[PDB]
Amino acid sequence: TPAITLESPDIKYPLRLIDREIISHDTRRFRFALPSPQHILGLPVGQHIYLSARIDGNLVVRPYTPISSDDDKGFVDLVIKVYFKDTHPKFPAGGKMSQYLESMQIGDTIEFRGPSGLLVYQGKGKFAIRPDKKSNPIIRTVKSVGMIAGGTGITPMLQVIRAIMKDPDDHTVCHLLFANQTEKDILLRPELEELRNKHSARFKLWYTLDRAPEAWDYGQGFVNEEMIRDHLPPPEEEPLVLMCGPPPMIQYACLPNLDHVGHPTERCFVF
Numbered sequence: 001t002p003a004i005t006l007e008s009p010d011i012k013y014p015l016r017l018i019d020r021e022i023i024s025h026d027t028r029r030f031r032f033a034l035p036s037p038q039h040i041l042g043l044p045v046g047q048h049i050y051l052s053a054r055i056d057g058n059l060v061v062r063p064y065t066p067i068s069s070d071d072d073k074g075f076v077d078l079v080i081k082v083y084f085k086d087t088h089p090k091f092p093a094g095g096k097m098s099q100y101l102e103s104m105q106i107g108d109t110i111e112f113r114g115p116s117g118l119l120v121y122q123g124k125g126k127f128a129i130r131p132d133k134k135s136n137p138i139i140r141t142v143k144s145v146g147m148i149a150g151g152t153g154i155t156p157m158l159q160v161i162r163a164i165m166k167d168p169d170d171h172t173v174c175h176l177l178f179a180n181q182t183e184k185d186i187l188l189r190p191e192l193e194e195l196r197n198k199h200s201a202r203f204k205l206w207y208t209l210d211r212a213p214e215a216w217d218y219g220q221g222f223v224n225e226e227m228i229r230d231h232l233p234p235p236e237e238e239p240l241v242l243m244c245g246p247p248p249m250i251q252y253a254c255l256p257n258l259d260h261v262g263h264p265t266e267r268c269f270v271f
């Protein structure tokens with residue numbers, strides 16, 4: 001009988017930072033305390049939360065999908081990539097929210113709001129997808145799910161992958177195509193490969209890198225038509241195709257190539 005954190009979609013909940021673990025040069029795991037050790041977040045699979053803060057005199061809000069689930073009591077874990085200032089020539093200021101998180105000290109609060117998102121996984125292949133906030137969800141059961149992720153776009157995918165895999169009577173097959181800049185930028189790799197080794201019948205996994213290392217058994221370059229053809233389920237299976245990554249990745253690498261392969265837009269969803 002766990003108390004729920006996100007009781008109302010219109011309340012901001014200030015949660016305290018209680019751990020900070022360095023994952024890579026620019027990525028971290030941040031753990032926040034829920035209101036009590038017995039609370040759960042209350043975040044339906046397929047949905048995300050928003051973080052909000054006053055940054056440079058304006059309210060800034062950004063979506064994040066936790067790596068924790070409603071099974072976890074008393075905490076929420078976020079994996080965050082920091083866009084550092086004075087690093088990119090065309091973006092000297094860096095990223096607003098990610099750097100706010102980066103500067104947070106133990107005990108500092110940040111406000112959570114949700115749940116949010118047009119898609120909810122209802123289990124055993126069933127997805128409930130609203131065309132917009134104001135409309136009812138369309139219910140469609142699928143045998144397989146294609147997933148294309150770039151960078152932190154992995155988190156909405158992992159959330160769904162984990163939900164499917166932990167249900168032994170969920171026979172949905174997930175095919176993930178995961179793109180990153182360099183090998184060191186592949187987030188949650190041990191977790192993904194642990195799941196693939198355990199659930200290989202239901203989980204297919206493929207990587208591509210903008211720049212690959214000398215020893216590399218996967219893809220290199222940008223996501224393209226052949227990669228989607230070979231590493232996502234065929235259009236005949238009528239899969240749902242999920243996408244999360246930088247908007248230009250969706251626009252140039254994903255949409256046109258899904259069109260080539262023959263996945264119709266009505267069976268595609270961008271987180």
Ligand SMILES: Cc1cc2nc3c(=O)[nH]c(=O)nc-3n(C[C@H](O)[C@H](O)[C@H](O)COP(=O)(O)OP(=O)(O)OC[C@H]3O[C@@H](n4cnc5c(N)ncnc54)[C@H](O)[C@@H]3O)c2cc1C
Binds near residue numbers: 078156
């Ligand atoms: C459903 C969903 C789930 C998400 N889950 C996560 C998650 O789990 N973890 C996570 O970290 N993010 C996640 N994101 C992305 C997140 O919402 C933000 O887009 C991200 O944190 C960057 O926001 P920001 O305010 O820090 O940067 P912004 O202020 O929005 O600016 C960052 C943008 O400016 C440019 N830029 C600025 N600085 C740099 C730099 N140093 N190097 C290169 N480019 C730069 C880039 O184009 C970048 O896209 C998710 C997004 C969605 C839609």
